[PDB]
Structure formats: C-alpha cells, structure tokens
Design a protein around this ligand. Structure first.
Ligand SMILES: CC(C)(COP(=O)(O)OP(=O)(O)OC[C@H]1O[C@@H](n2cnc3c(N)ncnc32)[C@H](O)[C@@H]1OP(=O)(O)O)[C@@H](O)C(=O)NCCC(=O)NCCS
Ligand SMILES: CCCCCCCCCCCCCC(=O)N[C@@H](Cc1cnc[nH]1)C(=O)O
Length: 330
C-alpha cells in the first residue's frame, strides 16, 4: 500500500512578491535578528534584482512566509536569503514547504544552477552537518555606540592609547574599485588562497566566488575597501554602507557591516578604526550596530580593542558566521 497524499484544509499558495505586500511582510518579521533585520530597508531593492525571485507563502490570502533565491557565480550558485515564517505560523512545517517550493522553482527556472549557498549563525547540528558542506566560517563581533558620543571622545581615546604605547594605528593603503584595485586584489590567486576565507568573498552575509562577473555585482553596491598593502596584501576589509534597521523601534538605528579577511590582528584593528572614522560623521545623531566579521582567533583582540580602547559596547558574546553549500540535485 502507498501513503496517500493528504490534503490540507487551508493549502498554501506560493507567489512572487510585489511591492504591494511590503507591509504584510513587515508584519511577519517582528523581532528578526534582534532588530538587525535588513529586509525592511532592502525589500524594494530586492524586487529590482534581475536574477532574484522573492517567494511568499500565503494562507487564506495572507502572507505567512518569505524566501529569496538569487542566482550568482555566473549561473552556478543559488543564494538563499531571508527565510522567515510569521510567528503565529511557526512549528507547522511551513518553512519546509516553502523551501521545497523554492527548490522546485530553481530547478525549473535555473536548470544550470549546481549548488545552493547560504549563511547562518546558529550552531550546526548533526542533520545540518550531514546536508551541507562548510565552505568557511568567520567570527562575529557585534558592538553598538551612539555616533556623536564616539565622535566626541575618539580623538582623546586615541591620544591616550598612543601616549601610553598601547596602540598606534598602523599605516593602511587606499583601495579604489573604479581604479581597478579591487579586481587586482580579488582576482589574485595568492589573495584567494591566503587572505580570503575559504577562497570566498563574504559581503554583508552574502557570499561571492572571486570572479569578474561577481565583481560587477559588488561594484554596484557602493562598498568601501581598505588593505594593509596593495603590493603584499595580508588583510583586506570591506565596509557595506550603513542602512536603517528596526532595532529600538524609533528609527534611530543603523547597521554598519564590516567584513575583514586575513590573519593580522593589528591590521584589522587599524582598518576597523579607519572605517569607523570614515563612516561615523555621516551617522551623527544616530545609533550604530557595528558588526565585524573576522578570523576567529582575532575576536578577543578586537573585542578588547572595541570595548576598552574605543569605548564601544559589546552587545553579545562570541558567535560564528557559517557559509554552507549543498548540491541541488543530490
Ligand atoms: C527559522 C524559521 C524560518 C523556521 O520556520 P518554521 O516554519 O518554524 O520551521 P519548520 O516548522 O518548518 O521546521 C522546524 C525544524 O525543523 C527542522 N528541519 C529539518 N529540516 C528542515 C527543513 N528542510 N525545512 C524546515 N525545517 C527543517 C529544523 O531544525 C527546524 O528547527 P527549529 O524548530 O529550531 O526551527 C522561523 O523560526 C523564523 O522565521 N525565524 C526568524 C527569521 C530567521 O531567523 N530565519 C533563519 C535565518 S538562517
Ligand atoms: C530552498 C532552495 C533549495 C536550496 C536548499 C538550501 C536551503 C536553505 C534554507 C534557508 C537558509 C537560510 C537563509 C538565510 O536567511 N540567511 C540569512 C543570513 C543573515 C543575514 N543577516 C543575518 N543573517 C539571511 O539572508 O537573512
């Protein structure tokens, strides 16, 4: 005897998101990432991405879940983002059904995609470690501060650290994307082997293989870069322009994401400081969640520098960003 497919009293309808559903999507997104959800600020931009499909699950005509798929890596990879189910619909298998629908959609619409990729900060259990390959992992440092408070006291803090011999910023070098410097770094095999984590660029949780096609995607985002030495690169940092996040409920918070690649902690310190100096003036009057992704063995050094040296508040303890990959057809 076979198992008969059983019907649901209220079947799910899967549809492509439009701008009209924005408010219903916010209504399912309360509390996500403790207020660091990017989707409020990014939803409308997602609707314009030519290789992205944003899928909504609906029950009785109302949105109850969302998942985005975006084809990258010259057609070989689908990046899965934003998976969420309304709190009043969780624990029923909705995320599973949505994932199953998006898997069918990708295979139908993008038959050349070979792998799925995603980033994830929850601990990998047996089931998870069985289904995915771990490409790489970065440590996550999350600190917060009032930008005007940082601006007022930073100079004096730096002077105290210099006078005491505790810290003086090491020289860093300019990186111009328009002038070709980013391509020279990211298309270098030695940079890919020795600097990038798992040979991968991670930018604001989004993984990219280091290729010309992906560099075009990065160049449209207005990133800022810094390096220790263009001639002999060992530490490369990438700052994503800050954007509003729902934390605090009051509109005063911005999210500043910095990805750091390489093993020299002193250079990560000096480059972090450079990015903070570049970004903080435009953030006067606002509050900042600053999240730095870096090689794990540097976390403690950077946490101390941020807290004690720079007077920023540590939001939480150590966690990790996992980059995971699975074959599409198994
Ligand atoms: C994560 C989230 C989307 C799950 O939605 P859900 O409908 O409750 O998940 P399901 O009921 O289908 O599955 C529950 C369990 O099944 C397990 N599971 C195993 N395989 C699964 C699969 N293919 N699909 C779904 N769940 C699976 C998971 O371990 C999951 O664990 P959990 O109870 O801790 O969530 C939901 O908790 C949420 O919206 N969180 C806020 C946003 C967020 O954190 N998203 C994840 C970012 S990577
Ligand atoms: C389903 C299609 C077939 C492929 C099979 C793979 C299934 C993967 C399921 C879900 C993966 C989770 C994706 C996600 O949500 N990543 C976070 C990262 C993040 C950003 N800021 C904080 N965290 C995000 O984009 O929000």
């Amino acid at each position: 005897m076979k198992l008969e497919p059983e019907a649901e009293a209220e079947p799910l309808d899967f549809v492509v998101a439009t701008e009209r559903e924005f408010e219903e999507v916010l209504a399912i997104s309360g509390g996500i990432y403790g207020g660091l959800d990017y989707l409020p600020s990014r939803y409308h931009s997602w609707l314009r991405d030519p290789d992205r499909t944003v899928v909504l699950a609906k029950r009785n005509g109302g949105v109850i879940a969302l998942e985005s798929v975006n084809v990258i890596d010259a057609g070989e990879t689908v990046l899965v983002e934003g998976l969420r189910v309304a709190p009043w619909e969780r624990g029923k298998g909705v995320a599973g059904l949505l994932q199953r629908f998006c898997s069918q959609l990708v295979k139908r619409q993008h038959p050349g995609v070979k792998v799925a990729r995603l980033t994830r900060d929850d601990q990998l259990g047996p089931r998870e470690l069985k289904k995915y390959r771990l490409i790489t992992k970065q440590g996550i440092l999350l600190v917060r501060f009032n930008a005007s408070a940082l601006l007022a006291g930073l100079g004096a803090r730096l002077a105290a650290l210099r006078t005491s011999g505790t810290f003086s910023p090491l020289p860093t070098e300019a990186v111009s994307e328009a002038g070709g410097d980013v391509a020279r770094l990211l298309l270098s095999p030695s940079v890919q082997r020795d600097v990038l984590p798992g040979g991968t660029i991670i930018q604001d949780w989004q993984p990219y293989r280091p290729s010309e096609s992906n560099l075009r995607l990065l160049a449209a985002k207005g990133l800022e870069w810094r390096v220790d030495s263009r001639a002999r690169p060992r530490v490369l940092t990438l700052c994503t322009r800050p954007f509003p996040i729902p934390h605090g409920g009051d509109g005063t918070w911005r999210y500043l994401n910095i990805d750091a690649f390489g093993s020299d902690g002193a250079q990560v310190q000096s480059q972090l400081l450079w990015h903070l100096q570049r970004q903080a003036p435009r953030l006067v009057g606002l509050n900042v969640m600053c999240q730095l992704f870096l090689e794990p063995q540097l976390w403690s050094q950077l946490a101390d520098f941020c807290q004690v040296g720079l007077g920023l508040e540590l939001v939480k303890g150590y966690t990790e960003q996992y980059l995971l990959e699975a074959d599409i057809h198994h």
